Amino acid sequence: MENFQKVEKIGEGTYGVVYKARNKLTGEVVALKKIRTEGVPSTAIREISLLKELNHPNIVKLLDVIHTENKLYLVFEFLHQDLKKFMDASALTGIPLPLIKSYLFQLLQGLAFCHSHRVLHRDLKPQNLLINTEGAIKLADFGLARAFGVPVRTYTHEVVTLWYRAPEILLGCKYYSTAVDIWSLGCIFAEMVTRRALFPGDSEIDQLFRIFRTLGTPDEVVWPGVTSMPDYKPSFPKWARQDFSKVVPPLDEDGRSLLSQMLHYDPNKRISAKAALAHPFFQDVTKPVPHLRL
Ligand SMILES: NCCCNc1cc(NCc2cccnc2)c(C(N)=O)cc1[N+](=O)[O-]
Hints:
Largest sheet: 5 strands, antiparallel
CATH architecture of the largest domain: Orthogonal Bundle
Bound molecules: the ligand NCCCNc1cc(NCc2cccnc2)c(C(N)=O)cc1[N+](=O)[O-]
Number of domains: 2
CATH superfamily of the largest domain: Transferase(Phosphotransferase) domain 1
Structural class: alpha+beta
CATH class of the largest domain: Mainly Alpha
Strand content: 15-25%
Active site: 123 (proton acceptor)
Strand order of the largest sheet: 1-2-3-5-4
Organism: Homo sapiens (Human)
GO biological process, one term: cellular response to nitric oxide
Distance between the termini: 26 Å
Site (CDK7 binding): 9, 84-85, 162
Enzyme class: transferase
Shape: globular
Radius of gyration: 19 Å
CATH topology of the largest domain: Transferase(Phosphotransferase), domain 1
């Protein structure tokens, strides 16, 4: 690199390969993401550039947008671990409730900030939630979905995870709202509590039906306009809704109440990040130190 020295490969993001790199001049350690095809839209670079101003303690800082050699690299602040790996490492005993609550609270603050600035994530998942030794958790990749349009695939035939997709997206809605992020975060909250993905679909229809089997097949009563959605089919099976007490045991009523509001079918009824922060579930929130092995 002209100013970077690759330390190692962090992985292969939905946009391209990601490396942990050191700025040879500043000595700064960062995450360098090479963006995937043949042209590089000028509209995309302007949009991404705007995100460099989106700074919040719970949002992974976009340090630079490098457009050279007709190639696009995104330089992000570096964090040592993602929530997916932390959840796997905490599988035996589970993440303690105080830490789950702290993380959810911080993620909601991050979403509230992004949403107030009209920036949506659209693809929240445990792998894009990064944590450090101080007890902080940050959202990574906000705004990239809109700026880079349709995701499709990473760049090396890697299957996209649908587990956190809101139902309006699965039903073919063309216009995303802030509510899609609240849905994803609700799914993540449930997974941290139970230690199992809430809706682990292996196809778009399996994803939709797993949601329906748990929350009940939506109808015009709970979701006005659902039967007119692009991919809605009158032939969808009609499943009865299950009780939250069975879905995320042994979470308490404050937690179940909040989760239920984050999982409302109607995006318009789904709780906002701002309103969620005021939920009684957070009355006793604190900021614990996680047991992180690096
Ligand atoms: N398959 C998805 C993996 C998540 N990928 C990422 C992980 C990160 N840090 C956590 C980490 C660091 C080193 C080893 N394992 C995890 C960072 C970052 N900003 O630091 C960026 C990305 N990313 O660009 O996607």
